[PDB]
Amino acid sequence: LEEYFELIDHHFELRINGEKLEELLSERAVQFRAIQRRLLTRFKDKTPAPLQHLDTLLDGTYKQVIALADAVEENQDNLFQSFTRLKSATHLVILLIGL
Amino acid sequence: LQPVFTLKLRHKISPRMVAVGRYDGTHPCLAAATQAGKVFIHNPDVSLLNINQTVSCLTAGVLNPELGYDALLVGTQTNLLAYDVYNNSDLFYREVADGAS
Amino acid sequence: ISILKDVLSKEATKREINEVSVKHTLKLIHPKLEYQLLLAKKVQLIDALKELQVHEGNTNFLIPEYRCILEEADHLQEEYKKQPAHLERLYGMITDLFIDKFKFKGTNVKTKVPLLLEILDSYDQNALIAFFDAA
Secondary structure: OOHHHHHHHHHHHHHHHHHHHHHHHHHHHHHHHHHHHHHHHHOOOOOOOOOHHHHHHHHHHHHHHHHHHHHHHHHHHHHHHHHHHHHHHHHHHHHHHHH | OOOOOOOOOOOOOOOOOEEEEOOOOOOOOOEEHHHHHHHEEEEOOOOEEEEEOOEEEEEEEEOOOOOOEEEEEEEEEEEEEEEEEOOEEEEEEEEOOOOOO | OOHHHHHHOOOOOOOOOOOHHHHHHEEEHHHHHHHHHHHHHHHHHHHHHHHHOOHHHHHOOOOOHHHHHHHHHHHHHHHHOHHHHHHHHHHHHHHHHHHHHOOOOOOOOOHHHHHHHHHHHOOOHHHHHHHHHHH
């Protein structure tokens, strides 16, 4: 009941980190969509105009989105490993309670 | 004198693009260009109109004297649009190709 | 001291170095050039971000980084008007410092200026001091 709780806490820390990463990815995606709509509006327009470095903001946001996606993937893998190890631990704990 | 009224509108007004027009027929309102190619309307709340295109002219007047409404005009370097803000309906959306300076 | 030497020699015709001083002057200059470059970098994106500001009221999407610029956009824009004079003055002062500190040793390095101009367009402060000490 004490070396068993630390695995639970590791699992839950990974879960919380995943939720944070996902709520950050949400904001990054919203930024990307907004800048993309601005660029589409500039495209549909006939008259020429400076891009005002909107493409640079788009590139920055795209880099942020890719970084966050890779982070979420790695967190998913870590969470899966932690879940398997926790399954083994709780197997042992049920065994030791049934004995 | 003294300013008989004052107010603060959160939108940057493009310099030469301002008009006053009774868009409700008897209720005068303010039409003024803004950044991003949007034209705002102050009724006495601010209402946005997506021109989605860099405005270059703006006025308001009586275009058909049969009715008593002011028509909001919006010029762009390749377009020209009359707008009946009350019953939102294009009076005419002409494409100039010479510009609206 | 270079200006004093030249002007006093001129008046006469009419009628030592601490090897770390350059480091001190460059450390003095560095904050000013850093501030000018950050000024330029922020005012480049001010208007692009303002185009996004007019829609969706900025409730949930704008990054905090550029949100720090959306407020002080006014001061940034009004300092950008005076920036280019300060940048040109700083470039001139740096090139005079370089030319003079090589002139005291008896050399004439009026030719390596364009490389210094390119370095300042890049402005790697450590590469800057390296170019100062080496050539």
